[PDB]
C-alpha cells in the first residue's frame, strides 16, 4: 500500500494517467487517485470482497463502496441519537436496581442496538414477513426492551429471563411497513442454537408456500469472537446453506469483537488473522466497522440486508468494540490484562461522543439544540417511574 513498492515517487503526484473508468473517469492525477482510494477503503469501514468468483456480484459491491455512505438528514440523525439514549438508560437501571448483572452488560457495545434496528427496518421495506433472532447472554434484556418491544413489567417479575423466548411487532417510522420479530430459547452451551434457529426459519418458509422467488423469513444470528473461531459447530452449520433441503435464502451474521474471551486474548484463541475468516472458505463478503461511529454502523446494516435479498447468500459483519467491566460480578480484569485496561478505564461513552459531534457542526438551531439535551432526561425518568 506504499507508492515506493510500485516504483512511484512524490514527483508523479501532479502528473495525469489513464485509469480505465475508475471514479467514472478516463484520466485522473495520482493525487486524486490516492484521495479516492483512502476515502473508500481506509476510514471507518473495511471491506473484503475481491475473493468472490462471480463478476456481477463483485461489481455490485465495488460500485456501492466507492460511491460512499450517503449524507444522512437531520431527522435521521436525531433518530440514531434517541436509540443510543434508550440503550444507555436501560444499562443504568439494570446496574442500580438489581445485582449480579455485571456479567450480562452491553457497556462498550451500545452500537449493537442501532445496527439491529437498521437491518430489521430495511427488511420491513423489502416487504418480508418475519425476523428470527438467536444470540447469547450478553445484551439479551436490552434486546428484549429496545428491539422486540416487551414492556418493563413483563421482563421483571423452571429457568431465568436470560434463556426464555419472546415475540413482538416492529413498525417503520418513515414508511408504511410492519414485520414480526421472534427470539429463540437456548442453553449456556455456546453456539448450540445455530442449527436449531436455521430449522425454525425453514419450517416457517415452508408454511407460507411462496416458491423459490420467496424466502421471506430472515435469520439474524449474533456470536462472540472467541466462540466463533473456536467451536466447530459454526462452520458445520454454514456448510448447509446451499443444500437442497436446508436452504433459507442467506443468514446475516454479527460477530461482537470485544478483543477478549473471559481471561484469554485473541493470540491464544485463534490461528486466523481475523475471527471472520471462515467467510473466505464459503465465498461470502465481510464488513469490518468501528463501534464508535454510529452513522457508519447504520449504513453497513442496510447494505448487508440489501445484498441478501439480491444474491441469496450469507453476509458477515465484524463490530469492533470493547468490554468495560470484567465477566465476573467481583473480578478485576487488570489482574491478567493490565495494559489493555489502561486504555479502557475513564473513557467517554459513544452517546456522549455523538452528542458533542452533532452540537459542533452548527446544523442545529437554538430550539433544536435544547431538545437533544432533554431527550436523555426523558428516557431516564420513564424507566425509573
Amino acid at each position: 500500500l506504499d507508492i515506493e513498492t510500485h516504483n512511484l515517487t512524490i514527483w508523479d503526484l501532479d502528473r495525469t494517467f489513464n485509469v480505465g473508468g475508475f471514479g467514472g473517469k478516463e484520466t485522473m492525477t495520482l493525487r486524486e487517485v490516492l484521495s479516492r482510494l483512502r476515502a473508500a477503503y481506509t476510514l471507518k469501514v473495511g471491506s473484503e470482497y475481491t475473493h468472490i468468483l462471480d463478476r456481477d456480484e463483485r461489481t455490485w459491491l465495488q460500485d456501492r463502496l466507492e460511491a460512499g455512505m450517503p449524507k444522512p438528514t437531520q431527522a435521521e440523525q436525531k433518530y440514531i441519537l434517541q436509540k443510543l439514549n434508550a440503550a444507555e438508560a436501560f444499562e443504568n437501571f439494570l446496574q442500580t436496581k438489581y445485582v449480579g448483572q455485571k456479567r450480562f452488560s452491553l457497556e462498550g457495545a451500545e452500537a449493537l442496538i442501532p445496527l439491529m434496528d437498521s437491518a430489521i427496518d430495511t427488511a420491513a421495506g423489502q416487504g418480508l414477513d418475519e425476523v428470527v433472532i438467536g444470540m447469547p447472554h450478553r445484551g439479551r434484556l436490552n434486546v428484549l426492551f429496545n428491539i422486540v418491544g416487551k414492556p418493563l413489567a413483563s421482563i421483571f417479575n423452571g429457568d431465568v429471563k436470560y434463556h426464555l423466548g419472546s415475540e413482538g411487532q416492529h413498525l417503520q417510522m418513515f414508511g408504511d411497513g410492519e414485520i414480526k420479530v421472534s427470539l429463540t430459547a437456548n442453553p449456556s452451551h455456546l453456539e448450540a442454537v445455530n442449527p436449531v434457529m436455521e430449522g425454525i426459519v425453514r419450517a416457517k418458509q415452508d408454511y407460507l408456500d411462496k416458491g423459490v422467488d420467496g424466502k421471506t423469513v430472515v435469520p439474524l444470528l449474533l456470536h462472540g469472537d472467541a466462540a466463533f473461531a473456536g467451536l466447530g459447530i459454526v462452520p458445520e452449520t454454514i456448510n448447509l446453506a446451499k443444500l437442497r433441503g436446508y436452504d433459507v435464502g442467506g443468514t446475516i451474521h454479527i460477530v461482537v469483537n470485544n478483543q477478549i474471551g473471559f481471561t484469554t486474548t485473541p493470540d491464544s484463541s485463534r490461528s486466523m488473522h481475523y475471527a471472520t475468516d471462515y467467510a473466505k472458505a464459503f465465498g461470502c463478503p465481510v464488513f469490518h466497522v468501528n463501534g464508535d461511529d454510529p452513522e457508519a454502523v447504520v449504513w453497513v446494516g442496510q447494505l448487508a440486508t440489501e445484498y441478501r435479498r439480491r444474491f441469496g447468500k450469507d453476509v458477515f459483519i465484524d463490530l469492533v468494540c470493547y468490554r468495560l467491566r470484567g465477566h465476573n460480578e467481583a473480578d478485576d480484569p487488570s489482574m491478567t490484562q493490565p495494559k489493555m485496561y489502561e486504555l479502557i478505564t475513564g473513557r467517554e461513552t459513544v452517546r456522549a461522543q455523538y452528542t458533542e459531534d452533532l452540537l459542533g457542526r452548527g446544523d442545529l438551531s437554538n430550539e433544536d439544540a435544547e431538545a437533544v439535551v432533554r431527550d436523555f432526561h426523558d428516557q431516564m425518568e420513564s424507566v425509573f417511574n
Binding site: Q82, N146, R374, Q379
Partner: protein, 103 residues
C-alpha cells in the same frame, strides 16, 4: 354522528393500541409519554411533552411543544396547523385520524 356540537374525535389507525378513541371537548388537551397526559401514548419515539390540541372559536389546531422527532400532518412537518376532517397526524410511531362533529 352522535358527537355533541363543538366536539371532535381522534382514532388510532396505526400503533400498539390501534382502535382506541379519544374525545376533544376542552380548550386544551395534552398528548405525550408523561403519565398525567390527557392522551397517554407510551413509546420511546414519543416525548414526555410532545403536542397540544387547542379549540379556539369552533376551530381545531395541532401545535408542537418542543419534541425531538416533531409532529407531521399528511406526511409533512409542521409547527402549527388547523385540521380538516380525515387528516392523518403522526406523533412518533403512532398515526391518528381526526373526525369533526356537528356545528
Amino acid at each position: 354522528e352522535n358527537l355533541p356540537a363543538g366536539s371532535a374525535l381522534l382514532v388510532v389507525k396505526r400503533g400498539p393500541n390501534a382502535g382506541a378513541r379519544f374525545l376533544l371537548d376542552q380548550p386544551t388537551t395534552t398528548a405525550g409519554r408523561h403519565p398525567e397526559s390527557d392522551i397517554f401514548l407510551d413509546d420511546v419515539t414519543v416525548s414526555r411533552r410532545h403536542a397540544e390540541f387547542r379549540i379556539n372559536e369552533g376551530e381545531f389546531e395541532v401545535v408542537d411543544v418542543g419534541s425531538l422527532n416533531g409532529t407531521y400532518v399528511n406526511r409533512e412537518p409542521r409547527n402549527a396547523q388547523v385540521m380538516q376532517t380525515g387528516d392523518e397526524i403522526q406523533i412518533g410511531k403512532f398515526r391518528l385520524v381526526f373526525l369533526a362533529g356537528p356545528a
